[PDB]
Write a protein that binds this ligand. Structure first.
Ligand code: HEM
Length: 291
């Protein structure tokens, strides 16, 4: 399967910076969502789940085709709760009907991270919508109730290595688990709509307790009111993972730099970019624009 990036006709940096600003302006406006967390965390989760279907072996799945717009992927049990990120973006797609679905879902994730004061993420245009029959089947996204060997093995399919996996998981400092979506409940920290390295700090400094929640699932709970998933706590159980966790709890700039590279790579897996294709765009935030 080859998927070649095709820039939307005649579009350039300024067009996509207009779509960025539209998403970012609505993130500021619709602030009440999920008890004032706002839409940013569900939008970086949506960009991860449309990319996380990729399989390196046959180049199926991935962010290129925008296939989450089809019922099979929209109704995947693993995507429960992401309909709220879709409905947030649907106004903006009506306003810029020329951007492809893959591009709009991935730029929403980029915009949310930078607007929640994360690192800049280089983003590239050119994903092309593909037919309903290209939609990957349910079951390619990871279970939460498993251990470190499962996480390592699952992420080899998206060929991410240990460092990349640990840098990507730092995004679980954002938002929260919702019992009616996943059977898990609670936030992982106090700053859950500002991008920081707090996931790593909480993992190493809190007093975790294995408890059973109302959906009868086990999760790691702390006195402070935070929770960690079994696959999250996995990172301090494995010796290779645990020493990268310590590296990111001791250096927030290295965390930001490595997250930026692994999230771009995540979003680009499966796509062939021609050598005459434009460079990756670095978008300015509303704040850097005085907007
Ligand atoms: C083995 C890996 C992973 C598993 C099992 C997993 C699982 C989960 C689960 C069960 C939730 C709760 C969903 C809900 O109830 O609403 C969640 C939320 C979230 N995850 Fe993951 N995740 C994984 C990796 C990642 C990665 C790599 C990213 C992003 C780079 C990510 C970003 C998020 C975000 C931002 C949320 C919060 C959503 C919200 O607030 O609504 N996840 N994760």
């Amino acid at each position: 399967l080859v998927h070649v990036a095709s820039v939307e006709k005649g579009r350039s940096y300024e067009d996509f910076q207009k779509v960025y600003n539209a998403i970012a302006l609505k993130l500021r406006e619709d602030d009440e969502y999920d008890n004032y967390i706002g839409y940013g965390p569900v939008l970086v989760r949506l960009a991860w789940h449309i990319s996380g279907t990729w399989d390196k072996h046959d180049n199926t799945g991935g962010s290129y085709g925008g296939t989450y717009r089809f019922k099979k992927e929209f109704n995947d049990p693993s995507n429960a709760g992401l309909q709220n990120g879709f409905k947030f973006l649907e106004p903006i797609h009506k306003e810029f009907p020329w951007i492809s679905s893959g591009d709009l879902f991935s730029l929403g994730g980029v915009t949310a991270v930078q607007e929640m004061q994360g690192p800049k993420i280089p983003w590239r245009c050119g994903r092309v919508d593909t037919p309903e029959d290209t939609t990957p089947d349910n079951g390619r996204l990871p279970d939460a109730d498993k251990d470190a060997g499962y996480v390592r093995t699952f992420f080899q399919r998206l060929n991410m290595n240990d460092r990349e996996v640990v840098a990507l998981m730092g995004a679980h400092a954002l938002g929260k688990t919702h019992l009616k979506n996943s059977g898990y409940e609670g936030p992982g920290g106090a700053a859950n709509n500002v991008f920081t390295n707090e996931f790593y700090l909480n993992l190493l400094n809190e007093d975790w307790k294995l408890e059973k929640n109302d959906a009868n699932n086990e999760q790691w709970d702390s006195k402070s009111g935070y929770m960690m998933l079994p696959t999250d706590y996995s990172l301090i159980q494995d010796p290779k993972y645990l020493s990268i966790v310590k590296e990111y709890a001791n250096d927030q700039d290295k965390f930001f730099k490595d997250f930026s590279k692994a999230f771009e790579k995540l979003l680009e897996d499966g796509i062939t970019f021609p050598k005459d294709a434009p460079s990756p765009f670095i978008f300015k935030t509303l704040e850097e624009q005085g907007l």
